[PDB]
Amino acid sequence: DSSRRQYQEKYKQVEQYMSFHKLPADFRQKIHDYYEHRYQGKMFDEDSILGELNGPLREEIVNFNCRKLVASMPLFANADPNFVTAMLTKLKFEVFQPGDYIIREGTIGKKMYFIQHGVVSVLTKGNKEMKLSDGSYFGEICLLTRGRRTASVRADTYCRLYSLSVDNFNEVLEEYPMMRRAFETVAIDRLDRIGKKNSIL
Amino acid sequence: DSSRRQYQEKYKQVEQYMSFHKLPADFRQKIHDYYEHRYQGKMFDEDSILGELNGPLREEIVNFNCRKLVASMPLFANADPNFVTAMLTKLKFEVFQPGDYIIREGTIGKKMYFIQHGVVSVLTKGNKEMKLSDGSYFGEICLLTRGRRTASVRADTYCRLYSLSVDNFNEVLEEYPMMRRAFETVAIDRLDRIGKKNS
Amino acid sequence: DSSRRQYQEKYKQVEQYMSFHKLPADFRQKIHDYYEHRYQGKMFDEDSILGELNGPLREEIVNFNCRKLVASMPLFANADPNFVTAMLTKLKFEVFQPGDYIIREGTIGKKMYFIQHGVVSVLTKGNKEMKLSDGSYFGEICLLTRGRRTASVRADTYCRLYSLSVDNFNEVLEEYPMMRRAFETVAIDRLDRIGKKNSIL
Amino acid sequence: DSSRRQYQEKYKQVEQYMSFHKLPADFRQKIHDYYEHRYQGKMFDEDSILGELNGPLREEIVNFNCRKLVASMPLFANADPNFVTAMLTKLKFEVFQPGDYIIREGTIGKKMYFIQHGVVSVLTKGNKEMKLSDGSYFGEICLLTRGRRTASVRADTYCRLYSLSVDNFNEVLEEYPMMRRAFETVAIDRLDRIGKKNS
Ligand SMILES: O=c1ccn([C@@H]2O[C@@H]3COP(=O)(O)O[C@H]3[C@H]2O)c(=O)[nH]1
Ligand SMILES: O=c1ccn([C@@H]2O[C@@H]3COP(=O)(O)O[C@H]3[C@H]2O)c(=O)[nH]1
Ligand SMILES: O=c1ccn([C@@H]2O[C@@H]3COP(=O)(O)O[C@H]3[C@H]2O)c(=O)[nH]1
Ligand SMILES: O=c1ccn([C@@H]2O[C@@H]3COP(=O)(O)O[C@H]3[C@H]2O)c(=O)[nH]1
After folding, report:
1. Ligand 3 within 6 A of C136 CB?
2. Going along D86-126, which residue ranges are E strands?
3. Long-range residue pairs from C32-37, CB within 8 A, at least 24 positions apart, any chain
4. Do D140 and D47 sit in the same domain of this protein?
C-alpha cells in the first residue's frame, strides 16, 4: 500500500536526481536495477517500526528476519542464542551488484560482511583470486587488527550481505569475548595465505 | 483525529512489513495485540511535540502524566521534587505482553524498570518465584554493580513499565547522590535472598 | 501559507495529545496560550531553512533576527562583530509564561539566558527577591563555575529569552577568551550579594 | 516533478519566514537570487537518496558528479583514485554571490574550499590582491596550522565551491598521509608571499 507508494515516490526522486546530474543511461539502468533488487517494490522505515516495539518483539523479528543467514553460518549455526541476537540486531542488510567493489585493498576498513546469498571474489595483489559464497564472511581482519584492507572484494553475482560496523563489532565482543577467537582463527588462515605471519591474533 | 489516522496508517505499514518479511500469522497477531495495548488507537511524535515546548511546560506535563506512578513508588515518597522531575524526564514508557521475559538471568543489563501497572514474576534459578507489582522496580542490581542479571523477570499480565537506562541512571544519581542509597538498600535485600554479597 | 497550515496542524496534534493524556482544562489553555505567544500562528523548520543557505547569508539573518537583543545588551552593544555573530548563531529563542520557573535553585545548570523582553524575579533562599529585565542575562554562574544553581528564576511576565548551552558557551569563549571577564564581573557581583566570596572568578 | 514542486514549496516557506522576521526587501531579493543559483528549480534530500544506496553506487555517483572539479585540480592529478574518492565523499557543495566574503582575515578557520567554477579575490592587508579560479583551493593554511585566517577571500563572481571541514580534512589525511605534503607546499608558498614563516 503506502509501502509500495513510498517505493514509487522515492524511485521517482532518484530518477529526478539522476536526470538533474546528467548521469549516463547505462548507470541509470544500474541504479534502477539496484532499487528493484534491494527493495522489491516496497519501502519501509524499519528503524521507526522496530522503535515502536519492545525488546522481546524486536528480538523475535531480527531472529526470524535473518533465519537464512543464521542457518548457513556455522559461527551462528552453533552459538549462544544471546550472542547471535546481539549480533543480528547490529547487522545492516546491503545488496551489491555484479562488478561492485565491496572492499578496496589498501583502504581503511570500518566494517565486515556476512554472505547470505551470492558469490564474491577476493583479489589480493600478489596472489590468485579465490571465491567466497553463502555462509562465509569477509572484512574481519581490519576489525580485528585495525590496519588496512588486505585485499579487494568484488561481487560476481547479485550479493545479499549483512554488514557489521567495527564499533558494533567491538560492542558485541566486549560482551561475548569468547567469540573473538572464532573470527581470529579464520583471519589467521587468510593472513597465512597472503604471507602475513601474524602474532596480533 | 490525525492521531487516530496516524495509528491507522502506521499499523498498515507494520502489516505490509510483516507480510514482506513473511512472518507467521500468530506472530502477526501478537504484534497486532501489542499495538492495540501500547498505542490504544492513537499515535503522536511526542519528541516533536515536547520539543516545541519549553522546559517548564515539559516538566509540568511529565509530572502530571506520571502522578500515579510517582504516588505508587516509595522511592519518590520522601523525595526532592527536583529529583523526581529529573528521573521522570529520563523514563521511557514500555508495554510487555503476558509471558514476555522483560529480563533473562545471566545476560548483561543496561536498563532498569519501574512498574506503573502489572505484575511480574522474578524467576531465580535456585529459589522460589516472587511477584512484583505497581510501584516496585527491578533490574537495578546490574545498574549498580555492572554484573550479570541475577534473575529472570517475566510479565504475567500486560505490563506498563517505564525504563531507565544505565547512562541516565548514573546522570541523575551524579546529580542527586543521596538517592543512590535507596536503590542500594533494595539491591542489598534482594542480593541477601539469593545468597549473594557484594562489597 | 504552509507556515500557517503547519502551525494549525501541529496545534491540532498538541490538542489530541492533551486530550489523550487527560490534562486539565486550565493547563490546556496555558499550552494554548504558549503556542500563540511562541509561534504566533506560524511554524517554520528554521534549522532546515538556514541549512539551505551559506555562512554569510546565515550570518546576516541571525544578526538581523536578534537586532533587538543586540541593541539592549551592553555586552553586545559594544563588542567585536565576529564575537557577537558567533554568540548569536548558538542562541535558542525561548518564550516563558508568568509563573514559570526558568531555573530552579540547587539543580545543575546547563544553560544561561539573555532577556530580550520581559521581567524575571531572582529568588535566592536566604535573601530578598530582585528583578532582572530587558538586556540583562542570568544563569551564567553555573556555566562559569559548573556547580549548582545559586537561585531560582521565575518569569513574572511573558518573557522572550535566548538561551545558550554550556558547551556552546565554552565553544565561543575558547575563541574569544577576552570576553569571559565580562560574564565573570557580573557573576562576582551576584555571588557577593548572596555571600559567596569567590576566587574561582 | 516533485523535485520542482519541492523547490516551489520550500521557497514559499522561505518567503513566509522572511516576512515573519521582517527582513528588508533587498535582503529578500538577495535570498531569492541565492536559491535560484544554488538549487536551479529543484530540490532533493540527497542524504536520503544516497543513504538508500550502497557504498559502490555512492562512490560512483560522487566521482561522476565531481569529474570536472577533479580534472581541474592539480592536487588530484597524480593521485590514488581511493584518495580522490575519500575526499570527494567528504565535500559539501556551496554557492556564494558576488561580493560575499567567503573568509575574513583574522577569524578562526574551520574549513577550506575548492573552486569548481568562479573567481575569488584573495585580499591581504599589506599586499596586493590576487585572484583564484577553477581548480585551485584556499583556506588550507588554518587547517594545517590552526592559526587565524591570513587573508580575506571574496567572491567576485557567482562561486560554486566545495568545502571540506577541518575534521574531515584530518580524517582523510590520517588515511593518506602522503597527501598532506601537497597541501603544505601550497601553504608554504602563500605564507612566503605574505612574509610569514612556520616551522
Ligand atoms: O586470502 C585472503 C585474503 C583476505 N581475505 C579477506 O579479504 C578481506 C579484505 O578486507 P580485510 O583485510 O578487512 O579482511 C580480508 C579477509 O576477510 C580472504 O578472504 N582471503
Ligand atoms: O531475589 C531477588 C532477586 C532479584 N530481584 C530483581 O530481579 C532483577 C534481575 O536483574 P538485576 O539482577 O539487574 O536486578 C534484579 C532485581 O531487581 C528480586 O527482586 N529479588
Ligand atoms: O543575587 C543574585 C543571585 C543569583 N543571580 C542569578 O541567578 C542565577 C541562578 O543560576 P546561576 O546560579 O547559574 O546564575 C545565577 C545568577 O545569574 C542573580 O541574578 N542575583
Ligand atoms: O598570499 C596569499 C595568502 C593567502 N592565501 C589563501 O588565503 C587563505 C585565507 O585563509 P587561510 O589563512 O586558512 O588560507 C589562506 C590561503 O589559502 C593565498 O592564496 N595567497
Report:
1. no
2. 92-96, 101-103, 111-117, 120-123
3. C33/C97, C34/B53, C34/B54, C34/B57, C34/C95, C34/C97, C35/B52, C35/C7, C35/C11, C37/C95, C37/C97, C37/C158
4. no
Are residue A46 and residue A60 in the same domain, yes or no? yes
Dump strand ranges (E) for B97-138.
101-103, 111-117, 120-123, 130-132, 137-138
Domain identity same for B74 and B166: yes
Residue B140 among known ligand-binding residues = yes
Residue with cell 506498563: B160
Together in a domain, A42 and A77: no
Question: Using CA atoms, how far apart are residues A149 and A109, in angstroms rounded to an integer?
Answer: 6
Nearest CA to B140 out of B176, B101, B179, B175 is that of B179
Ligand 2 atom at shortest distance from the alpha carbon of B150: 12
**Protein residues whose CB sits closer than 6 Å to any atom of ligand 1:** A 103, 109, 122, 124, 130, 132, 138-142, 149-151, 153, 190, 193-194
D123, B71, D14: which is closest to C53 by C-alpha? D14
My answer on whether C14 and C101 are in the same domain is no
CATH of the domain at B26: 1.10.287.630
- Give distance in angstroms: CA of C128 to centre of ligand 3: 13
Q: Domain holding B73: CATH number?
A: 2.60.120.10
Residues 83 through 102 of chain B touching chain A, CB cutoff 8 Å: 94-96, 100-102
Whole domain around residue D131: which residue ranges?
Answer: 67-199
Distance C114 CA to ligand 3 centre (A): 12
Closest to D134 in 3D by CA, of D155, D154, D159: D159
Domain count, chain B: 2
- Resolution (angstroms) equals 2.0
* Contact present, A57 and A49 (Cβ < 8 Å): no
* Ligand 4 pocket test target in D75, D112, D114, D141 with most atoms within 8 Å of CB: D141
Listed residues A13, A46, A66: the one ending a domain? A66
Determine the Cα–Cα distance for residues D106 and D152; give it in Å rounded to an integer: 8
CB contact under 8 A, C61 and D23: yes
Which cell is B37 given? 495495548
Residues 6+ apart with CB under 8 A from B32: B11
Is the CB of C153 inside a 6 Å radius of any atom of ligand 3? Answer: yes
Amino acid at B44: F
Residues A131, A144 within the same domain: yes
State how far residue A194 is from chain B, nearest Cα, in angstroms.
Answer: 38
Q: Based on the fold, state whether residues C27 and C106 are members of the same structural domain.
A: no
Residue numbers belonging to the annotated binding site of A for 3',5'-cyclic AMP: 139-140, 142, 149-150, 190
Pick from D28, D49, D66: which residue ends a domain? D66
Nearest CA in chain A to D176: A107
Q: Given CA atoms A166, A167, A170, A175 in this order, what sign does their dihedral have?
A: negative
Assigned C-alpha cell, D114: 575548492
Alpha-carbon distance C15 to A110, whole Å?
A: 46
Together in a domain, C31 and C71 = no
Calculate how close chain D gets to C76, using CA atoms only, in Å.
18
State how far residue B57 is from chain C, nearest Cα, in angstroms.
8
Does C142 count as an annotated binding residue? Answer: yes
